[PDB]
């Protein structure tokens, strides 16, 4: 199952894209990890388990409540 839970109600996903795109392309593209987010991360359930990861590395800039929109958006969306 998903380890990120559905979108609340009326989720503004315009801005949560806006966050992906700030926070996912400091340290690398985030185009250069696509193919493997997607297989590895996307269809096995583990979006909140790899962003969580880079939101641990120094300089991440990634607040709890950032991980919890890029996590949605990333699920959800991408
Ligand atoms: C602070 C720098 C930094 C930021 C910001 C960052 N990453 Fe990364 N990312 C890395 C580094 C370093 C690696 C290579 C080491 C690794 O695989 O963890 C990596 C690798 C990855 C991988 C490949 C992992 C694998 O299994 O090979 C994915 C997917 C990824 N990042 C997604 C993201 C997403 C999504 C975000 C935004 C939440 C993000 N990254 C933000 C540093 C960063
Ligand atoms: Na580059």
Request: charged share 25%.
């Given at each position: 199952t998903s380890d990120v839970p559905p979108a609340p109600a009326g989720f503004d996903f315009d801005?949560?894209?806006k966050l992906v795109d700030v926070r996912?392309?400091?340290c690398?593209?985030?185009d250069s990890?696509?193919?493997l987010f997607?297989?590895?991360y996307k269809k096995?359930?583990?979006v909140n388990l790899i962003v969580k990861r880079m939101q641990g590395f120094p300089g991440?800039?990634?607040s709890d409540d950032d991980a919890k929109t890029i996590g949605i958006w990333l699920h959800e969306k991408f």
């Open positions: 801005a949560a894209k996912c392309n400091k690398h593209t985030l990890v696509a193919d997607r297989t590895k096995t359930g583990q991440s800039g990634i």
